[PDB]
Amino acid sequence: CASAPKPKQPSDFNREPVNKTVPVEIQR
Amino acid sequence: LDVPSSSRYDHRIRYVTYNPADVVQVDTVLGVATHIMLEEGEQYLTHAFGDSEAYAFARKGRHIFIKPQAELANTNLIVVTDRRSYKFRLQMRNDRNGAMYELAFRYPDTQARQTREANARAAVEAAFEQRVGAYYNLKYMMSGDKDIAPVNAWDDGRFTYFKFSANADLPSIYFVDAEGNESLVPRTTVGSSNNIIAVHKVNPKWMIRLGNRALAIFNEAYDPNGVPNDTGTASPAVRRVNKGGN
Amino acid sequence: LDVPSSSRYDHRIRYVTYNPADVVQVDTVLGVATHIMLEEGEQYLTHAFGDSEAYAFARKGRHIFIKPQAELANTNLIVVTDRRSYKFRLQMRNDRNGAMYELAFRYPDTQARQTREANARAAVEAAFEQRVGAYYNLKYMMSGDKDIAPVNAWDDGRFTYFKFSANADLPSIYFVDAEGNESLVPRTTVGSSNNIIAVHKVNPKWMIRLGNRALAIFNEAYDPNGVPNDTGTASPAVRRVNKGGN
Amino acid sequence: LDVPSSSRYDHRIRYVTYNPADVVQVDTVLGVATHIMLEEGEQYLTHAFGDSEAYAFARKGRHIFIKPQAELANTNLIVVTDRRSYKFRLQMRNDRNGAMYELAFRYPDTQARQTREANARAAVEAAFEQRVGAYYNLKYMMSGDKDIAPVNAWDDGRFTYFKFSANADLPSIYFVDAEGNESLVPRTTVGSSNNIIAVHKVNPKWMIRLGNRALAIFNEAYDPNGVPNDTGTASPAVRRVNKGGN
Amino acid sequence: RLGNRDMLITQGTQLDCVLETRLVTTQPGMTTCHLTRDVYSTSGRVVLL
Amino acid sequence: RLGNRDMLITQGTQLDCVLETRLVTTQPGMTTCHLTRDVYSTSGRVVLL
């Protein structure tokens, strides 16, 4: 009558590119 | 027959250049203690005299003490250790002059070995850091609890790097399958200030969790092809050879 | 041969500086015990005489006593320790004058190292104190029970500080997550009167408790970026290096 | 009689090549101890003098120490070891000139046998890798969860291979019967980069499984005849012989 | 008195780490977590962990 | 301090392998799995297994 609760599932609406800027460790 | 080179302060202390193909001459005067210093880490096996009663022998570890105790002592010593075997040609000095108090060995063989292998790590480290001929892909989406977002994410075709601001709490990463099942992935931490976490896989999905907060990462250009790890090292420049033999 | 330099108080009391490549001229007269101090904390391994029956040798840790006990004693003495190897030229003085009551070694290397380490320590202390390269943020408001409110609060982008007056009990400090669940962060007390509580994070919110009274703190210039810790210390003026090596 | 030739630096250190068909000449003078070095890892059994009293023999490991104690020391040394036996002609020299401080052997037998074994192993490996007279089948087919499918599959007539993209996980491969049951099959991973998995049966049907996802591999040209494996190994150009006899 | 307050973590210094592995208590096994934040010394000047 | 972080694996390095032998727990038996992902050393530079 009960199961292990699943961990929070993230929503999939607010989609953004992760890299706003080129990362400096790319030597860029 | 190398005669050891006199120390500039006093000739009674002499340095000599070691050689496995030459025997060093030892000048001993009546009633002085001859000091032999072995290089660090020599495991002493045994020695041999030309006359066990001619010279007095005392040893503990890498220190050898020689002293003539019988008149007219013209013999030789063969001392053997795990690495090498030192050879000496003892002449008893008849005038109690030109005494030599201590002998020290210079080992060009050990210098040559260690300098070579020092250059070995030099080349290894240079090849590791140089990382030229590698491409970077940056197309990554994101969704979920934005507060724990990584400031940047990218992949090199072998790994995937996530970075966080200096005030950002380092989260956990879980590798996501096609069906939505989470599973572990080994993470290594690199970077100047431990702000780079690198996961050891490239996957068209990733998920980041901390507390009761979550976040998903999409690889918009997951390349299943990749580059084969032709050398078993993170670089394409470090060959990996089988030492153990057998 | 290093002839020791006599003290200005008496010529029987003399000093000599160590040198790896030279011996020491020891002119003992009969009926006197020659006093030696080795340097602090050095461990004896072995010694060696030319005529063990010429002199008498007493060792108590770093103490050495030698005296001639046989007429016409002209030999050499070598006492070896972990850090170095010592050299002496034992020569008995026939007129029973100008004896060497004691010898004291001066070491360039260890004295310098002790001086160098104190130099580095002082530099580190001054670098920590000067506290240059600091940016301070003050946009902090509070809400709740004013009884245990700090009289001042700010952060430097690496640590968050709080100040309480001398008449208030120091309350606890709690890091509040995004959701609203408290948790622990380390706190270090600093300040002239131990009236400064400094916590090791920068957070938009903070919680303050004592008894059944509670208080909130809000950061309005919470900079997610912060400053990277390229050095691994509290300040950008102190490097932290791996002395373990190995 | 073999007489050793001295080293260029010292006439006392002489190098000589071992031979079982002749006996080493050793020219010993009075007052020297000769150092003899056996081959590394050689196991000494026993020895023999003409006069056990004439020379002293102290031995530890692979090192042999000799010195004459009586005049006219003219006898033989026959020391036996597991791999061979060494033979010497100890001849006393009355002029006490031209010493023999040591003697080191340059073995032709051990390296000569090693080169042959390395040559045989090289021929064996060349026979395996050359892999000629091989026909290839490529008509392979799939259906199912394509996401973990191999990039390529083929059979040589004996073994079935699957190559996977270097970014993909290595899946588990199972055997499929004509009925629909599943059976474990032995797999060996070959290739430069461990991206080629080899199973040891040519079969009409295959199932590949991972996690909750499955893929069935279909052979469209299963040839029941195959090629007989009459040489007892994967190669057609290598046999397997029963060396144990009996 | 403590020896070197700049290289020491004393008893009662709470570390905050994130639990990497899901924990089920039916069978005895081991777990793994990663520190989320640097931890300083008691004197609070050096990052040790 | 670990000796050579380029050639070593420590506690907690979670491996991952696909299970081959369908497990049934009535009688004690044995199990077999094949590693799927190349595992790197702690330095993250060399493929060990």
PDB file of C-alpha atoms in Angstrom, chain E residues 24-46:
ATOM      1  CA  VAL E  24      18.982   0.915   1.485  1.00  0.00           C
ATOM      2  CA  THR E  25      19.446  -0.652   4.902  1.00  0.00           C
ATOM      3  CA  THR E  26      18.342  -4.215   4.178  1.00  0.00           C
ATOM      4  CA  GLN E  27      21.901  -5.402   3.618  1.00  0.00           C
ATOM      5  CA  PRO E  28      25.091  -4.076   5.204  1.00  0.00           C
ATOM      6  CA  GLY E  29      27.173  -2.146   2.690  1.00  0.00           C
ATOM      7  CA  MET E  30      29.215   1.016   2.342  1.00  0.00           C
ATOM      8  CA  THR E  31      28.305   4.508   1.131  1.00  0.00           C
ATOM      9  CA  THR E  32      29.955   7.484  -0.525  1.00  0.00           C
ATOM     10  CA  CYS E  33      29.473  11.238  -0.277  1.00  0.00           C
ATOM     11  CA  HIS E  34      31.286  14.269  -1.664  1.00  0.00           C
ATOM     12  CA  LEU E  35      32.101  17.412   0.285  1.00  0.00           C
ATOM     13  CA  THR E  36      30.183  20.326  -1.182  1.00  0.00           C
ATOM     14  CA  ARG E  37      32.124  23.140   0.494  1.00  0.00           C
ATOM     15  CA  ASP E  38      35.730  23.660   1.460  1.00  0.00           C
ATOM     16  CA  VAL E  39      36.385  23.183   5.166  1.00  0.00           C
ATOM     17  CA  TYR E  40      38.833  25.476   6.912  1.00  0.00           C
ATOM     18  CA  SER E  41      41.015  24.976   9.960  1.00  0.00           C
ATOM     19  CA  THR E  42      39.963  25.830  13.485  1.00  0.00           C
ATOM     20  CA  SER E  43      41.834  29.113  13.162  1.00  0.00           C
ATOM     21  CA  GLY E  44      39.999  29.503   9.867  1.00  0.00           C
ATOM     22  CA  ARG E  45      42.779  30.460   7.465  1.00  0.00           C
ATOM     23  CA  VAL E  46      43.761  27.394   5.404  1.00  0.00           C
TER      24      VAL E  46
END
